[PDB]
Each structure stands twice: as structure tokens, then as C-alpha cells.
Design a protein around this ligand. Structure first.
Ligand SMILES: Cc1ncc(COP(=O)(O)O)c(C=O)c1O
Ligand SMILES: Cc1ncc(COP(=O)(O)O)c(C=O)c1O
Lengths: 368, 368
């Protein structure tokens, strides 16, 4: 099946990380950023680039006093292990409702430097309510569960005074609203809403989280240096990382932050993803062969939309035909095992392209 | 001081990592690799890119049967912690003679999952001989010590049958000769001879090293998943990494590998760095205000040249003037504390630009 060009989106990338890298943003690598490549991360030109990223994120996320942008190599998966060693003192409570929220709880359960976590589960497509427990000093959940398309509210739970709020915003940060004052560690990686590459983690940390990192280091608890949050904080405060970061990753990230801030900031990004996701969900509701996987509209992610298909319409065949027509990465999370499409709607994704995608899906399904 | 343009090198980047990224190599990001950006690392287009990197390195390093290219996020610093958990069974022997060889031994000493390492030290600017011990199952040293400009032979020591040869080739791999059959783990990162970005580690592993990784995993020894060599092996064998890799790091690396292979492979790269380094060392010998830091010519690195300056010629002032004229990153290793310049001569660096640099240094020194 050859989809007519007239109905095709301008950009066919609907992947949930890595995701659409804007043409003008990628072009900065051979132009405005060409002179930064291959230069020292211990010298002013690359340190100023890290500085642009940190102050840019501080502006975009309206950071309260004493909050800091901390960064290091590895991506969000490395941050899970760094946080298990460095942020959790004795015990944590985790909400699990998909791949990424479950994987952080599983990393904490296996880590022999911290206690057995309390795990509150819910079926995929749903989420438990943010909650606390008197025996925990960390409470963790994902702002956006990328495998299921579920977005959860980011609020400091009642009676959680003695616990840090540790939020995996890998696919949520930059596309969803957030009051950073409600968090202690709001972490992410650049390949989703920030339209950059993986291999770097970023974490917005509160004064309580920074003090906690210092207090845990002061106990003498061992941590491999690569996963050390005290070393990552020491370096981040001076526009550096512990080891050599990727200049391309920082250059693409800084360009996306500038673009988001220049468009009106987080409020603009949230309006944009609301617009894209409204097009996707309204279409999924209208068509008799589709339905949103997430039944609670309050949990339906603005940035990652999981659309279930009925028995007689094979979503896998639809995804294959779309891919053969250059409309890529609509395949559901590889481990979920559902007759579903997963569509990313991060701010780089044009809302009109989400509309064009739905028309392409209708066109293909009518010819199956 | 304004250095006349006629004597300036075409490219002023002499940094030892990050290092000179060729422009035509950087331009593939906006052309032949542009469509790869923002696409899934779990789908064929990015998996084929990893495939190109693995096959390319297999060709460049003339890999014997059963040797495999393993990769993961983090850079070489992450590989030290991954190797301490995953390659060392009971005890290791380390050679230390600068920043990077010492830091790996220090990471192993602090790791509470393995024994206390045997450490064989030498003064900076020198190196101990590769040697073994009956109580160790791993012997480790750096092919190239980036902090002192010392290159060491890579050979399997006599009577080391029960020990894996674990070589930190971060600044050596692709610019220095090597017989891979003499190694069990030959690891590096892409920001030096491979003219790409940091944040990714690569390791050429022997069948004995791969079997060792499996045997250590089979004991049930815990390892944080991000630093897991069994998981990195499982993913690498199917052109993947454990978590999201940077597409730009892979795309720049594959272009450099292709450029090196097309030029005549490792033999061509070694001739090129021999040519560049001959220009630097002969000039350092000729001038009465300079001398190579490394007194043993057999240990003088072809890729990283440390040139000491006499008391009355301030190398720091020279470095500052060069930097103000766009000739950057000649500053010595930040912790060495010597009146010295450090010049990288990786294959992307044109030998004529090393000659031009020496003329620029003469010009500046004559006007101090
Ligand atoms: C020899 C050597 N080993 C290890 C490293 C650490 O590399 P990375 O910053 O990629 O972790 C470096 C960095 O310069 C190095 O030159
Ligand atoms: C919510 C979430 N958490 C964590 C991760 C891990 O990210 P990375 O590959 O950067 O380690 C991902 C990856 O898709 C994710 O979406």
C-alpha cells in the first residue's frame, strides 16, 4: 500500500524516545556549534554550553530558590542506580504501572545498599494515587509512563514531610505541566520532549535532596564513582560532568530549550502537546475500530498516546505499512503485547502532523 | 599578540579528548545520517548503524575468531566500574603511572565485590613493565596515559595464563599499533582517535573475557544494571545497548572508522600519528627552551605529546596566547602541575598542522 503524499505528515517520526529532531535544530551541529565540537569540557567554550543548558532549564522550569540543575553521563537508566545509592537513605515507596516505573523499583529492590522498597502497583493503562508511608524517606513515580501512555499528577503527598519526591520525568519533562516546588528530584534524559540524544541524565534537585546526597555520602556508604551523585553535584555546580559528555547532545538540548523558552516556555509546550493529543484522542474515540488504552481521561498523557485497536483491525499490519511509507516508530512498547499503536506528541511534533497521521491510519485501515 | 595567519594551522584543535572532529565527518549528520536522528534504537535503521560500528571496528582491529565488539553508555569511566563488577573474579594487578591508570586501580580498590588489587606504580612520564602475579585473574594498564603522554606496549605477559589482559586504550585505540590477540578487554571511548563524542564505551573482548563475564554472572554476584557487562554483551550481540545511545556519537564514530579503513586501516593511522609526533618531538629536541617530558623515547606517545618548557619560558602564557589566537587545548593535564604543553596528534589532526603549531609556538616565545 502506497499512502498518497497529500495526506502524509511533513515529518513521519512519532517515536517516544529518540524522537523528532527539528531540521533547523540538527543544522546547528555543522554551523553555530561546529567550533565547540572536539574542544575541552574543562575549558570555557564547552563549560559555557553546559551553563546555557543549566540556566535554560532553570528558566523553563521556574526553579525555586536553592534548586539546582545536576547532570551526568548515562541517561535516565544510569540515574536509577545513582539515586538508589545516593538519594535513598533506608527505604523507598514506589508506584509501578508500566516498564519504567517498575524498572526503577526493581533496581532499588536488588540494590544491597538500601532497604526493601514498598511497591504499590496498578494494571498497565492505569496508575495508583501518589501516597506516602511512615517507614520511607523517598517516594518515587513516573510523571509519564512511556510504555502505557499514562501521565500522573506531580504533587507532594499529604504527610510525606520526611520523604523526598523522586520523579522520573524522562518522557514528561518539557511537555507536561509541573510545579517543581512539589519535587525533590525531577529527572529526565534529552531524547524525548527535548528532541536531543540519549546518554545524558539531567535532574532538577531541591535543597533537601542536595542536603540528603551530602548526608548519605558523609555516612561513608560506597558508590561506584560513575554513579556518584555527590561527584555529579560537585561537577554540575561548576558547569561540568564527572567524565566527558557528548557535545552534540548538549548542543541539540540547548537549542531545544532556547526554542521552547523563545516560544513562551513550559505553558506554550503544554498547550502544544494538549493540541496534538486532543487530535489523537478525539479521533480514537470517533473511530469504531480504535479506543484509547487509558480509560481514565485524567491519566491520558498529552505526550505519549496509546491507542488500542479492535480484534479485526491488526495494528501491527498498520504500523508495518506506515513504516514502509516513512511514518515510523508507532509500534507499541515491545514488551506490552497489545494490538496497539503508540504515538509521541512531544513539542517538536507538529499538531497538524498528528492530524495527518490519523488520516493516514484511516486510509490504510479502509484498504486492509 | 596576534599570530600571523600564514603560519597558523588549518585546524587549531590539539585537545586530547574531546579532539578534532573533521568537518566533512560532522556534515554526514545533516546528510546521510540525518534520517537516523530521532528514530528508535530498537528498530532496523539505528540497529544497522550499531552494526556498521561493530563490523567496522572488527575490520580496523583485525579481530581474531570469537572476539566481539561490546558497547554501552557511559564512556570509559563507566567501563572501569562495570569491569570491576564484571571482569574481576577475585583480584587484579594494576600498573599506574598517571591519572587514568591510577583512577581504574582506585575504583577497583574501593569496590567491595572484589579483592584488594596489587598496584605497581612508576613516576609520571615513565611506566612499569607489564607483569603478572599468581594471585590475580586480571592484569590492567593503559595503552596510552593521556595525562603524561606515555604509550606502553600491549603484550600478554609471560606466565599470565590464568589472567585476563584488560587494556584502557581510551586515547590509544585507532592511533597506535596493537595485536588484539594479546588482549582480553581492549576498551575505549569515541572522543580521541575516533574523532566522535564521549558518553559511550566500546570494548573489544576475547572469548576468555566473554566466558569470564558469564561465569561471574552465574555466581549470582549483584551488579547495578546500568554497569552490567552481561546485559551489555546480550544487547551488543544484537546491535543494541542496554539503554538509549546517542545517534550522533554512533554516526560520527562510524564515519571515522570508515575513513580510517578506506585510508589503509590501522597501519595508515599509525603512520599518520608517527609522522605528526616525529614533527613535535624533533622540534622539542631542537629548541633550547623545550624538552619532551618522557625521557625514554620508547615510551613517547605518537598520539599525545607532553613537552616541558624551561623555567624562563612560561608554557601557561604560551597556551593562553595560542588559545586567544584560536589554537586551543594545549594546556597540560590540569592536575600534573608542570610548565608544559600537551599536544594531541590523533589521525584527524593533520601532520602539517603539528608543524604549523611548532612555528606558532616559536613565534610567540620570540615575542615574550
Ligand atoms: C586513558 C583514559 N582513560 C579513561 C578516560 C575516561 O574517559 P571518559 O571521559 O570517556 O570516561 C580518559 C579520558 O580522557 C582517558 O584518556
Ligand atoms: C519514563 C522513562 N524512564 C526511563 C527511561 C530510560 O531512558 P534512557 O534510555 O535515557 O536511560 C525511559 C526510556 O525510554 C523512559 O521513557
Amino acid at each position: 500500500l502506497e499512502i498518497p503524499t497529500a495526506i502524509k505528515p511533513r515529518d513521519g517520526r512519532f517515536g517516544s524516545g529518540p524522537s523528532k529532531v527539528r531540521l533547523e535544530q540538527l543544522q546547528t551541529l555543522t554551523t553555530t556549534a561546529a567550533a565547540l565540537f572536539g574542544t575541552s569540557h574543562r575549558q570555557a567554550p564547552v563549560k559555557n554550553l553546559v551553563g546555557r543548558v543549566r540556566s535554560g532549564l532553570a528558566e523553563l522550569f521556574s526553579l525555586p530558590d536553592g534548586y539546582e540543575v545536576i547532570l551526568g553521563n548515562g541517561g535516565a537508566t544510569a540515574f536509577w542506580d545513582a539515586a538508589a545509592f545516593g538519594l535513598i537513605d533506608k527505604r523507598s515507596l514506589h508506584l509501578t504501572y508500566g516498564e519504567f516505573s517498575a524498572k526503577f523499583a526493581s533496581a532499588v529492590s536488588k540494590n544491597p545498599f538500601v532497604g526493601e522498597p514498598i511497591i504499590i502497583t496498578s494494571d498497565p493503562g492505569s496508575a495508583p494515587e501518589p501516597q506516602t508511608d511512615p517507614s520511607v524517606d523517598v517516594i518515587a513515580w513516573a510523571h509519564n509512563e512511556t510504555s502505557t501512555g499514562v501521565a500522573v499528577a506531580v504533587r507532594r503527598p499529604e504527610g510525606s514531610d520526611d520523604a523526598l519526591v523522586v520523579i522520573d520525568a524522562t518522557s514528561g519533562a518539557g511537555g507536561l505541566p509541573v510545579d517543581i516546588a512539589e519535587t525533590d528530584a525531577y529527572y529526565f534524559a534529552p531524547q524525548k520532549n527535548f528532541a536531543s540524544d540519549g546518554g545524558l541524565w539531567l535532574a532538577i534537585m531541591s535543597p533537601a535532596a542536595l542536603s540528603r546526597i551530602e548526608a548519605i555520602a558523609a555516612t561513608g556508604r560506597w558508590v561506584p564513582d560513575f554513579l556518584s551523585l555527590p561527584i555529579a553535584v560537585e561537577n554540575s555546580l561548576k558547569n561540568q560532568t564527572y567524565n566527558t559528555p557528548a557535545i552534540a547532545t548538549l548542543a541539540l538540548l540547548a537549542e531545544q530549550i532556547d526554542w521552547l523558552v523563545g516560544n513562551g516556555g513550559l505553558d506554550w509546550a503544554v498547550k502544544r502537546t494538549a493540541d496534538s493529543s486532543q487530535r489523537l484522542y478525539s479521533w480514537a474515540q470517533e473511530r469504531p475500530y480504535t479506543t484509547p488504552f487509558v480509560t481514565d481521561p485524567g491519566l491520558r498523557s498529552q505526550v505519549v498516546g496509546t491507542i488500542d485497536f479492535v480484534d479485526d483491525v491488526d495494528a501491527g499490519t498498520v504500523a508495518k505499512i506506515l513504516r514502509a511509507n516513512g511514518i515510523v516508530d508507532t509500534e507499541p512498547y515491545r514488551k506490552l503485547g497489545r494490538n496497539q499503536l503508540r504515538v509521541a506528541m512531544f513539542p517538536a511534533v507538529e499538531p497538524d502532523d498528528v492530524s495527518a497521521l490519523t488520516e493516514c491510519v484511516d486510509w490504510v485501515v479502509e484498504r486492509l
